[PDB]
Paper text:
In our current work, we obtained X-ray diffraction data from crystals soaked with compounds 3b and 4c at 1.56 Å and 1.58 Å resolution, respectively. Unambiguous electron density for compound 4c was observed in chain B of TDP1 while the active site pocket of chain A had no compound bound. Compound 4c was observed to bind to the active site of TDP1 with the benzylphosphonic acid headgroup nestled at the base of pocket lined with the catalytic residues. Direct hydrogen bonding interactions are observed between the phosphonic acid 03 oxygen and the of the side chain nitrogen atoms of N283 (3.0 Å) and H493 (2.7 Å). Additional binding interactions occur via a network of water-mediated hydrogen bonds between the 03 oxygen of the phosphonic headgroup and water 828 (2.9 Å) with the side chains of K265 (2.6 Å) and H263 (3.2 Å). The 04 oxygen atom of the phosphonic acid headgroup, however, does not hydrogen bond to any of the active site residues. The Y204 side chain stacks against the aryl moiety of compound 4c via a hydrophobic interaction. Additional hydrophobic interactions occur between the side chain of P461 with the phenyl ring of 4c and W590 with the imidazopyridine. In compound 3b, the phosphonic acid headgroup is positioned approximately at the center of the HKN motif while the phosphonic acid of 4c is shifted approximately 2.6 Å (with respect to the phosphate atom) towards the H493 and K495 residues in comparison with 3b. The phosphonic acid of 4c superimposes closely with the hydroxyl group of the Y723 side chain from the bound TOP1-derived peptide that is covalently attached to the vanadate (which mimics the transition state).
Human tyrosyl-DNA phosphodiesterase 1 (TDP1) is a 608 amino acid DNA repair enzyme that processes 3′-DNA end-blocking lesions by hydrolyzing the 3′-phosphate esters. TDP1 is of importance because it can reverse stalled type I topoisomerase (TOP1)-DNA cleavage complexes (TOP1cc′s) by cleaving the phosphodiester bond between the TOP1 Y723 residue and the 3′-phosphate of its DNA substrate (Pommier, 2006; 2009). When acting on TOP1cc′s, the target phosphate ester bond nestles in a well-formed pocket that contains the signature “His-Lys-Asn” (HKN) catalytic residues. As we report herein, we have designed phosphonic acid-containing variants of our previously reported carboxylic acid-containing imidazopyrazine and imidazopyridine inhibitors and we have obtained crystal structures of the catalytic domain of TDP1 (148–608) complexed with a subset of these inhibitors.
Residue numbers in the entry: 162 to 427, 433 to 562, 566 to 607
The structure:
Amino acid sequence: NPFQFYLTRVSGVKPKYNSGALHIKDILSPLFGTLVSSAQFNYCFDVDWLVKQYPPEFRKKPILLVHGDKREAKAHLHAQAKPYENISLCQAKLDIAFGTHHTKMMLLLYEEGLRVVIHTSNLIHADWHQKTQGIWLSPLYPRIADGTHKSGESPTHFKADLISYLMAYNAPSLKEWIDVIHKHDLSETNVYLIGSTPGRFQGSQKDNWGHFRLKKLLKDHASSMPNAESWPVVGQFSSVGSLGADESKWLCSEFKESMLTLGKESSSVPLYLIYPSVENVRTSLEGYPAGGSLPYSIQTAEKQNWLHSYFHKWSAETSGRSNAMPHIKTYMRPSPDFSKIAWFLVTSANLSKAAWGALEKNGTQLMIRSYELGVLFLPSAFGLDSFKVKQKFFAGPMATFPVPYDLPPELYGSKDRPWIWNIPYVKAPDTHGNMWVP
Ligand SMILES: O=P(O)(O)Cc1ccc(Nc2c(-c3ccccc3)nc3cc(-c4ccccc4)ccn23)cc1
């Protein structure tokens, strides 16, 4: 495969469903490269656990933790890291209220080159144990020889775009990583970077981030096909923000409109949203505790009941993962019979305005609250018009894209409800024998 899209290993599926999955210990293994230093961008960290995932021989190499914690939360993270003198921290600035540092990325500097890993998991044991999570593994990028002047740039502009994403932090530890990236050749990269950073973007910057970045890439590097209005949009996520009083406020006005863009010329497009039901969570490998990583609150949900008529169950027989609750987030554009896709995105971004951006100032400004990061797979970047959908995720005819859950998505039944984490479920016990009492 050219795609280098992986799921994380799941404890409690048959070996055939972990063949070609990756655990964090595999990503950090000496087989992937001889580690010199690393940067871990994330939201949540268990530092004691994290250090143990590195090979023993690499555990004293410098590690930078890039986080967004403030006040007592920041103090707690510093206290976690203080025993490890090789660990440095970078607090990403969050100058708009209610934003988070949500990006999940590893920068892995080796004796042999550089690797970038953009993924969906927090750095805690539970996120790598029984969840469905997604990973994009970059190629091993070689160093550009000193005295050689070359760009090291890919046709997708990934090198400059990654440097642009890091430059937005205005952080000295990350300028050091920018200088590392400048010294490497990233020209083999076949994915497009889609980041969000906090800010209010106008004019020459509105297309840099969030859903306007997606829109721009789709305008420039995808083409429209006949009957495009029949090609659905699928969004798949593990958290839901406050989207407004009806679908016209954000979801089906600006967000869907970006997602349905194809090509450069100027809606009945079906919108599928995949989000675990209560029954998905109850019968999951983790049971109700899976719902601690699905933080949809009743205060939010009761303001937007209109949204749940878009919701489809989690189902992943294709990857043996129907009972491994999703923390991956994905967005894609399948054909009307779901046999092909026009593009696929794996990202940290959930279904929220904070992550994707909301237009302000009479549509002239895009405001984003958070840091997010994902990679976009476009057929044109592979010499193709569309991707075939892989019938079985771990099977083997490889310009076929490995979609990790089942198509078509299945609508909630009349008795299903979205998982809402702060109300009790005491009607039926979970796979461990327990109820859920927040
Ligand atoms: O796929 P088929 O045709 O049905 C053939 C088939 C039938 C039964 C199993 N049972 C099974 C499961 C299993 C089962 C059901 C749910 C979850 C996990 N996990 C394992 C792991 C090993 C193992 C042994 C040594 C070293 C490393 C791994 C052996 C068996 N395991 C596996 C395959």
